[PDB]
Each structure stands twice: as structure tokens, then as C-alpha cells.
Amino acid sequence: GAHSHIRGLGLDDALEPRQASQGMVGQLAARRAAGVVLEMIREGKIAGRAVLIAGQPGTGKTAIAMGMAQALGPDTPFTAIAGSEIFSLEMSKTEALTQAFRRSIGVRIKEETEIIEGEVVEIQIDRPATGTGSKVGKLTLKTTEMETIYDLGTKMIESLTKDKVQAGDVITIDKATGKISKLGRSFTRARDYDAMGSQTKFVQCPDGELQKRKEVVHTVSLHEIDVINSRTEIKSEVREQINAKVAEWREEGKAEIIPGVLFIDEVHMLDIESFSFLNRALESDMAPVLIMATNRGITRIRGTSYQSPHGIPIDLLDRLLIVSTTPYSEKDTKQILRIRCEEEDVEMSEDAYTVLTRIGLETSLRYAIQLITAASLVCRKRKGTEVQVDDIKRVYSLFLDESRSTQYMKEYQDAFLFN
Amino acid sequence: XXXXXXXXXXXXXXXXXXXXXXXXXXXXXXXXXXXXXXXXXXXXXXXXXXXXXXXXXXXXXXXXXXXXXXXXXXXXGXXXXXXXXXXXXXXXXXXXXXXXXXXXXXXXXXXXXXXXXXXXXXXXXXXXXXXXXXXXXXXXXXXXXXXXXXXXXXXXXXXXXXXXXXXXXXXXXXXXXXXXXXXXXXXXXXXXXXXXXXXXXXXXXXXXXXXXXXXX
Amino acid sequence: XXXXXXXXXXXXXXXXXXXXXXXXXXXXXXXXXXXXXXXXXXXXXXXXXXXXXXXXXXXXXXXXXXXXXXXXXXXXXXXXXXXXXXXXXXXXXXXXXXXXXXXXXXXXXXXXXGXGXXXXXXXXXXXXXXXXXXXXXXXXXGXXXXXXXXXXXXXXXXXXXXXXXXXXXXXXXXXXXXXXXXXXXXXXXXXXXXXXXXXXXXXXXXXXXXXXXXXXXXXXXXXXXXXXXXXXXXXXXXXXXXXXXXXXXXXXXXXXXXXXXXXXXXXXXXXXXXXXXXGXXXXXXXXXXXXXXXXXXXXXXXXXXXXXXXXXXXXXXXXXXXXXXXXXXXXXXXXXXXXXXXXXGXXGXXXXXXXXXXXXXXXXXXXXXXXXXXXXXXXXXXXXXXXXXXXXXXXXXXXXXXXXXXXXXXXXXXXXXXXXXXXXXXXXXXXXXXXXXXXXXXXXXXXXXXXXXXXX
Amino acid sequence: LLAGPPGTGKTALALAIAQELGSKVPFCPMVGSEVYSTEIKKTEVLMENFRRAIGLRIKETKEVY
Numbered sequence A: 001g002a003h004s005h006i007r008g009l010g011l012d013d014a015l016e017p018r019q020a021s022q023g024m025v026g027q028l029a030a031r032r033a034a035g036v037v038l039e040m041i042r043e044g045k046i047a048g049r050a051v052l053i054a055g056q057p058g059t060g061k062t063a064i065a066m067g068m069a070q071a072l073g074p075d076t077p078f079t080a081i082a083g084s085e086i087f088s089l090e091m092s093k094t095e096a097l098t099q100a101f102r103r104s105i106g107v108r109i110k111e112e113t114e115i116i117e118g119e120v121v122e123i124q125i126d127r128p129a130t131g132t133g134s135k136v137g138k139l140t141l142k143t144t145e146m147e148t149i150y151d152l153g154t155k156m157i158e159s160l161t162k163d164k165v166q167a168g169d170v171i172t173i174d175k176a177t178g179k180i181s182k183l184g185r186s187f188t189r190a191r192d193y194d195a196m197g198s199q200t201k202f203v204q205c206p207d208g209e210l211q212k213r214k215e216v217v218h219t220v221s222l223h224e225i226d227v228i229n230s231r232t233e234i235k236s237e238v239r240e241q242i243n244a245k246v247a248e249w250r251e252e253g254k255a256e257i258i259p260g261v262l263f264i265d266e267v268h269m270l271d272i273e274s275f276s277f278l279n280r281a282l283e284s285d286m287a288p289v290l291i292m293a294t295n296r297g298i299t300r301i302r303g304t305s306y307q308s309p310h311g312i313p314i315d316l317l318d319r320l321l322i323v324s325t326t327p328y329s330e331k332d333t334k335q336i337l338r339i340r341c342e343e344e345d346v347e348m349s350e351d352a353y354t355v356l357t358r359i360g361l362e363t364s365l366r367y368a369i370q371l372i373t374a375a376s377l378v379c380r381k382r383k384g385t386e387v388q389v390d391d392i393k394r395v396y397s398l399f400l401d402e403s404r405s406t407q408y409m410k411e412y413q414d415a416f417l418f419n
Numbered sequence B: 001x002x003x004x005x006x007x008x009x010x011x012x013x014x015x016x017x018x019x020x021x022x023x024x025x026x027x028x029x030x031x032x033x034x035x036x037x038x039x040x041x042x043x044x045x046x047x048x049x050x051x052x053x054x055x056x057x058x059x060x061x062x063x064x065x066x067x068x069x070x071x072x073x074x075x076x077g078x079x080x081x082x083x084x085x086x087x088x089x090x091x092x093x094x095x096x097x098x099x100x101x102x103x104x105x106x107x108x109x110x111x112x113x114x115x116x117x118x119x120x121x122x123x124x125x126x127x128x129x130x131x132x133x134x135x136x137x138x139x140x141x142x143x144x145x146x147x148x149x150x151x152x153x154x155x156x157x158x159x160x161x162x163x164x165x166x167x168x169x170x171x172x173x174x175x176x177x178x179x180x181x182x183x184x185x186x187x188x189x190x191x192x193x194x195x196x197x198x199x200x201x202x203x204x205x206x207x208x209x210x211x212x213x214x215x216x
Numbered sequence C: 001x002x003x004x005x006x007x008x009x010x011x012x013x014x015x016x017x018x019x020x021x022x023x024x025x026x027x028x029x030x031x032x033x034x035x036x037x038x039x040x041x042x043x044x045x046x047x048x049x050x051x052x053x054x055x056x057x058x059x060x061x062x063x064x065x066x067x068x069x070x071x072x073x074x075x076x077x078x079x080x081x082x083x084x085x086x087x088x089x090x091x092x093x094x095x096x097x098x099x100x101x102x103x104x105x106x107x108x109x110x111x112x113x114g115x116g117x118x119x120x121x122x123x124x125x126x127x128x129x130x131x132x133x134x135x136x137x138x139x140x141x142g143x144x145x146x147x148x149x150x151x152x153x154x155x156x157x158x159x160x161x162x163x164x165x166x167x168x169x170x171x172x173x174x175x176x177x178x179x180x181x182x183x184x185x186x187x188x189x190x191x192x193x194x195x196x197x198x199x200x201x202x203x204x205x206x207x208x209x210x211x212x213x214x215x216x217x218x219x220x221x222x223x224x225x226x227x228x229x230x231x232x233x234x235x236x237x238x239x240x241x242x243x244x245x246x247x248x249x250x251x252x253x254x255x256x257x258x259x260x261x262x263x264x265x266x267x268x269x270x271x272x273x274x275x276x277x278x279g280x281x282x283x284x285x286x287x288x289x290x291x292x293x294x295x296x297x298x299x300x301x302x303x304x305x306x307x308x309x310x311x312x313x314x315x316x317x318x319x320x321x322x323x324x325x326x327x328x329x330x331x332x333x334x335x336x337x338x339x340x341x342x343x344x345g346x347x348g349x350x351x352x353x354x355x356x357x358x359x360x361x362x363x364x365x366x367x368x369x370x371x372x373x374x375x376x377x378x379x380x381x382x383x384x385x386x387x388x389x390x391x392x393x394x395x396x397x398x399x400x401x402x403x404x405x406x407x408x409x410x411x412x413x414x415x416x417x418x419x420x421x422x423x424x425x426x427x428x429x430x431x432x433x434x435x436x437x438x439x440x441x442x443x444x445x446x447x448x449x450x451x452x453x454x455x456x
Numbered sequence D: 001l002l003a004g005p006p007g008t009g010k011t012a013l014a015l016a017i018a019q020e021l022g023s024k025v026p027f028c029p030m031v032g033s034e035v036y037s038t039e040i041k042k043t044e045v046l047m048e049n050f051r052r053a054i055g056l057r058i059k060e061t062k063e064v065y
């Protein structure tokens, strides 16, 4: 959720940054280049191309990544995993990369039917059904909130004629929200009491749907379908037959797949055998787009004995688009803070809004944020319900920055490791 | 096809429209792809009754109820052909309110899927439907869907054409749509269209008024 | 886009809005022999200036209207009307122009509004036809101007029905437009404009208050429905609506009452806040409708609602005493009301009974709210008032005008209760009166029984 | 990315954290060297020490005199 606020690159139609759209601060040149890349994508020119972000650490360039993910579409799949996360004990590297890719592709699987859901005593005015339309009015049945004034659908009679008088009525009877009902495609029905069997003690729970309807996808990722079809390390025959399954699904037009975008960071964690997979993987039929982010300089490629910029093999480097920009200033950081502040739903004095940035701007964005909640708890303690400098600085008793965290504690180390 | 030939339509064809009522029953069994064939049959059939169609008008009414059901259960291209055929008649303009529910089926189509298929139909359907039907209220509803298609939906010549049918409605809605704006390629096209009537004569009108007064 | 350039223009036209026009009006008045040249000249002049045309029309219309109101549109009045009509027709076409046109249209209507005022001889009819076209092509905002339309609605309702109902059909469509969709495309709430439409609904209630067509009823219902179920709250319109509700409910099929009932419970809370803003209207209305049912004595479900409303009357009285209160004033009001209702059959019954109802309510609650020997002062007079209720009604009630004993019972009960909760305090002259009146009535056994029991 | 604890008396605190989070919760301390075992391999001991650290509060009903 460290990027919930993000909504996209935030530029005009002429590829110019309105500097605050979508909730992204400053960082002009980066967003601009990212927009150019967005274009490149929308014309398939990124075929046999990828883009690498030469970031500065302690900043998590993921921001612009998520932004591009948004600006591509509403729900374009987007996964971000760490380069080091491929050396598992269980999964092979191939297994891991394949899982990532099949986790970067989605589908469109919607369907149709009609039946209500709800919970009320089995004395129903909709136990009969007039037909298509409201047939209820300001009908008032028992829910846990209040009575209702609403409209209903068509097929409500038979099911309640099917509904026997049960001890426990989370069954298709009525609606009592207050506003609106209908049938909808539920088919998620049985005859059952309104409770389950709990761990410590056992009590009753008055519950139940108010309504129910969905033209469903609710399963959208190539990787999702797989664990759907495994236990509640994946057998290939499952995958290919799933791929075989969808292979026709798409033909009818019933199903539609979209590319996504995948984001690795710390690419220098990989090795040649990993890259060799990618530049073969990417040139496939409909592979998603790829973005990478490092903060190392000239470096030895892992798995060999050679230097190369960022530790990337030349062949891959030639076919790349390199983007990079600056660490933050002050002004932005405050603005950056506010965003996360309001996202974290915290009462911060603009007085605090100085003592804190002067920490982060000196130390790092991704750490200062990491403190934000850590003050609310003493605000919960001091009853203060608001954060001036009063708190983080007070709990700067228990607070200190990265050099302080890393280095001065590395100096806490360098204190004693001297002996 | 015989009816198309015998299109002269004797009482044989009157009862062929009764056979089309039997074909409506054929359709019921859902006749599968054969109901699309039956739809064609009925289309012709419809074509006959064009003479008087009072009983036939009601024959068709019953039939149309069923037809509506057919294309609502949603029997694709079937519906397209049917729709047009149906339309070619008269007299329902409430049947088209049910057809507005069919255009409701026409939305969510956001793709870009395989071809203009369904859309083409709708596109085609539009002005034709618009010519008669004239639930202008739902004209606006329809228009919403139309607009989208027109904007960006692969087949632009169809959307444009669909919009041209909508253009014929010549609406406050027409001008509203125009004003509303779009990818504008098509909007400009339609806006340009966005005229066609002729009048004036700030003298002729006056004369007419005078004449009227005199008459009074 | 490019219509901002045009809106600037529309604004200007409005803003700016004349030799031609003057000439035209004057000459129109003075045309009586031969003048077509002048006529067409004028036309072209005030064609280039739609605003001018409209304005001219309006003023002319007004003067014309007064003089011609004195009649059923003979000769020149008719001429004028027709001229206007023709012009409009032509221009309506010509002037598929701006929103200057829109507001000018509003003005025109408004004159047409006044034309209808007495409904002329059809001039208004043709103006309505123009509107029908007009509104039929409108899809515009001009909310306020929509109000002139309000005037028009009223006008048509006063002139039989027919094409004004079609204009209702037009107006029905217009109401749909009030709660519509151009702004839906834009995308928002309003809420505030729902309340704007609730004011209109005040105008729709006036349409109801005229006569004919179930459309209004439907509308009302919908409006109210919409209005709540969300959670929306802001006061004055609610105060209004009620009045209207009451009115139509009285008028027929008591659906108004149902609406009102729901509203009322809600408002008892909601109107606790609304009485902070003085649900003065609410109070009066409440009383009115309470009595309306009370006259009917009791409309079951509505009556059931009203038994609960007797309880809610008490509830809201804890607030209507803030509106108006205490022993002295209570009694005064009661007496006045009594006299009034006595001197007034059904509605006088209503007045007096309302008071009692209020009075009776008050009585049991005031057994609960207070005094002992100071109570007596009012008590005897309360008893007196109770006796006086029967004095003013009872047999008066027994002939025509429609209330009930219920009150009697109520009062008795409350008093009894408090009193007994102690024991015997304080009865006295109030009690004297009580026994007397009890006896007086002796109808029927129920009440008599009650009396005796209370006494003992 | 940080630094920290030298010398003595750390695990005391781990066990402290153990007691306060309710009584009798799982606490299985292990050293990093465990995984480099020749008999069994890593994943084994890893999952083992995990399911060492999972508490089940089994509530049972007994027929008592």
C-alpha cells in the first residue's frame, strides 16, 4: 500500500507535467521520459526493447513504475519483485521467472445469470414474485441494520417456495438495506444457518448478504488460474492445458487477455543465466513490458568475471532505454510527506512538516515515511490526537535517522568493534 | 424465397404469413442456426403482409414478442437481420423500447475484439431503427451508445454511418452531441453534416402571417 | 470549446438587450389600414437581434394583455397574438442561437404565462405549442426560467386540462429534466439541486393544489423517496413538502398521509433539528394533519401511525412547548380554539379537537411535568377546559364534525397516573368538575366506567 | 539496512516478548548454523523450526467426576 496514492504519470495531452496530477510530485524529466515510453508502447515499437531506471536508492523508483502501470490502463497487471527473490530453496530460477510472467498477464471471463441473496426470517413478501420490476416498494423486512425502501427483480417466488422453514436463514429470502435490491447472478446459495463453528468459544452471528450480483471475472491472472487448479512448484501439464484451455476461451470472444508490466529492482542480483532467459523470454509472442531499476554503478556481472555498466550484459544494454533523475529537494519532500500523511490519516502540524523532512531529506524518503505511524502510537499514548514536532522529536528519543540507523549504529558497532 | 417471388402475395402469402407464425413457433424450439434461417424466412414474410397487416400486424405483434425473446435470449446475427426486417414495418415503437434493452446488450462492448460484427449490425440498425421506432426518448439512450462506438471502435465508417443515422434525428440532442465533442474526426464529419434544411425569407413569412390574419 | 466564443456572444446579447423595435410596436398598434413594408422591415431588423425581438414582444404583450384581458381576444388583440406567434415560429427556427435565446424564451413564456393568466382565447394555447416545440428542443438549464414554467403549469391547471396537460406531459417531461442528465454526463450530486427541485416540488405541490393528473402524485412520491434513503438533511424544504403532502393527502387516496407518517418519525428526530431551526411550519402542519386524520378518526394504519403520533406529539411537544407553552397559555389557546371550533362545525371541530388533543396529550405529560397545589390553579381550569371541550363540542360534536372521547380518556389517565403514584393529590375543584362532566356525558358505559374508577 | 546488538543478554528480550503476548505461546530459538546440516537439508530444518513456532489452543470437553 506504499503507493496507493499513485494514480499515474500526470501529464497533459502534449506530454507536459502538470506537476501534481495523479498525485506525483516534481520529478519532471523522469515523468516526461516515461510518457515518451508510454507512447512507444502504444505503437508496439517497444518490440525487442525494455527500459531501465538508473535510480538513487532510499527512494524506491517504483513510484514511476506504478504510475506507468496506471497510465496504461485501469487494471493492467503489474508485479514488482526483487532480483534476489529468484534464488529460492524450492522453486527453480526458471520456475520463478515463469511464475512472474504468468503473474503479469490477465483475462476477461464474465458471465450471466440472476438470483438474489439475503438474510431475513422466512416470512417473505417476495416469497411470491409478481415479475420483472420492483414488486416490493418500501417493503420492510428484518436485517441487522433497519427496514428498507427499495425495488426487487423477477424470479423471487419459487426459491422461497423452495425455501423450507429453516433454523438459520442465510438463504434467498429478501433485502433490507434501505435503498435497493435485485436478483443478480449469485448462484452462491445453499440452505444453511447464519453461523459457523469458532475456535475458543461458540456464539451465534446475525449476518447475511444484503444483495448479490456480479458479471464475474474475479480470477484474473495467468498465474491465478494455476493455483486455482492446484492444492489449496507447479506441474507443467496443468499450465499448458490451462494455456490449452484458454487457447480456445479467447477464440469465442468469451475471454480476453491483456499484457501487463513487470518490474524488477536490484538487477545486479541476477546472473547471466537469468538474463539469457529474458532476452529470449521477452521476444516471445505477447510478453508484457519490462522495467528494471538499479542503483549500482559500473559493476561485475554476477556469475562471471567482467565489468559492465550496472552489471548488465552488453547485448541487453544496447537494446535498452535508460531513464534517470535527481534525488529530492526539500519542497517536494514536504509535499511528498503530506501525501503519505493524509493517506495514513494522521494529524500533522505543518510545524512537524519541517522537523521531519529535514530528517528525510538529509536521510531518505523511504525511511522518514517508515516513521510516520511510529508517532501515532505515542499520540495514542499522549492522547494528543495530532502530530506537531511535539511527538516524533519527543520520540526522537526513540527515533534517529539512517546514518544514525545504519551508520551511527554501524558506529554503535564501530564503537565496540573497535575492540 | 418463394414468398419473395410470389411477393405479389395472394391469400397463399397471407397464410404464408400464417406459416411465418408457424415459423415463429419453429423459432421457439430455438431452431439453432436454422432460426436465423427462419428469421430470414419471417423477414420475407414480414415483407408480404406489407399490404395490410392488421391481423398480420397482430400476427407480427405476437411474433415480435417471441422475436424479442429470441434475440434477448440473444441469438446474435440473427437479431441483426431480424431487427432490420422487423423495423421495415410500422406500429410498435414500444417494441423498440424492448430493442433499447437490446442496445443495452450492445454496450460493455469496449473492445476492439475481432471485427465490427455485432457493432456493424447495430451501426446498420441505428438510422434504420431511427427512421421508424421514434421513441425519441430512447433515441437519446441509443445515441449514448452510438456516440461511443462512433468515437473509436475499429470500423469508423460504420460508427460514422451509425452516427449519420443519428444525425438524421437532427437533434437538440444532435447539436448537443456535436457540442459535446469527441475524437472529433468523426465529430467534424457529423458537425459538417450538422445542417441540411433551408428556410429564411424574412419577407415570405411576413406575407404568410398577413394572409393568415386576413383569413381570420 | 467554440461555444465559449458563442457564450461570450450570448452573454453580450443578454447584456446589451432599438429604433426598429420601437417603431414596430408603435406601428403594430397603429396598423389598421396598409403597412406590410414596415412590417417586414421590422422583422429583418429584429431577426438580426433575437433579443430585441423578444423584448419587444414581451413589453407589447404586457400592455396588450391588460387591455385585452378585459375581453376574449377579439380583433387587434388576436392580431397581436398571431403576429407574435408567427414571429416566434419563424425565429424559433432562425434563432436556434444561444442561451440568450434560452432566457429570452423564459421571458416569452413568462409573458405567455401572463397570457394564460386568464387564458385569453388560445393565444396562450399557441404559446404553449411553441413551448412544446421549445421545451421539446430545450435540453438546456435555465432553472429559474423553469419557474415561469411553474407559472405556466398553474395557468394550464386553471384552464380545464387538455393541451396544458400535454404541456403537463410536456411539463412531466420537464420535471424529468429537472431531476435529469446533461449534468449527469458532466457528473455530480445536487442534493442541493434536488432541494432546488424540492422547492419546485413546492411548485409541483401547487400543481397538485390546482387539480387533474396522477403524474404529480407519482412525482411527489419519487421526489420524497429520492430525498431520503440516501441520508440527506438540510431542513426548510422538508418543512414545506409536508404542507403540500397534507394538502394532497386530504384531497384523496391518503398516500400523502403515508408519506407524511414516515417523514414525521424521521422528522421527530430530524425535526428536533428542524425545530432548532423552528419547525414552525412543521408544528402547524403536524397539528393540521393530525386533526385531519383525527377528523377521520383514525384511518387504521394511518390511525395506528397517529396513535404512535400521539406519543410523538408528546415527544415533539417537549419541543413545541419550546415553540409555545405552560399552564396559562395552554388553557388560553384551548379556550380560543374551543370557541372557534364550536362556531365552526367540521373545521371548528378540527380546531377545538386539535387543541384538546394537544390539551389531552399535554395533560398526561404535565401530570408527569409537575407541581402539586400550584398545579390545582391550572388543574381546575384544565378540568374546566376539558369540561369546556365538551361544552364547545360533545353534543356539538354529536351532531356534525368529527373527533372523539379518546381525548377524555387520555387526559383522565395521565392525571390519574401521576396522582395515584402518590395517592390522592390534588383533585379538588378540577375533580368536582370532572365528576360533573362525567355524569353529564353518561355516554357510554365505557367512559362512565372509566370516570368512576378514576374517582375511586 | 541498519546496525545493532553486541555481546550478551539479547535472547532474554525475545523470551520477554514471548511471555507478554499471552501465556504459553511458541518460542523456539535457533542459531543460524542449524541449516548447514549434512543429514537433512535446509528446507527440512527451516519448515521444522517454523512449525515449531505455531500455537494451537485446543479446547477440549471432558466428562468429569
Ligand SMILES: Nc1ncnc2c1ncn2[C@@H]1O[C@H](COP(=O)(O)OP(=O)(O)O)[C@@H](O)[C@H]1O
Residues within 6 Å of the ligand: A023, A024, A025, A027, A030, A053, A054, A055, A056, A058, A059, A060, A061, A062, A063, A064, A323, A324, A325, A326, A327, A328, A336, A339, A365
Ligand atoms: N510520491 C512518492 N512516493 C514514494 N517515493 C517517491 C515519490 N516521489 C518520488 N519518490 C522517489 O524519489 C526517487 C527519485 O530518485 P531519482 O534520483 O529521481 O531516480 P532516477 O535518477 O532513476 O530518476 C525515486 O526512487 C522515487 O521512488
Ligand SMILES: Nc1ncnc2c1ncn2[C@@H]1O[C@H](COP(=O)(O)OP(=O)(O)O)[C@@H](O)[C@H]1O
Residues within 6 Å of the ligand: D007, D008, D009, D010, D011, D012
Ligand atoms: N533492570 C533489570 N531488571 C531485571 N533484569 C535485568 C535488568 N537489566 C538487565 N537484566 C538482565 O539481563 C540479563 C540478560 O542476560 P542473560 O539472561 O544471560 O541473556 P543473554 O545471555 O541472552 O544476554 C537477563 O537475565 C536480565 O535479567
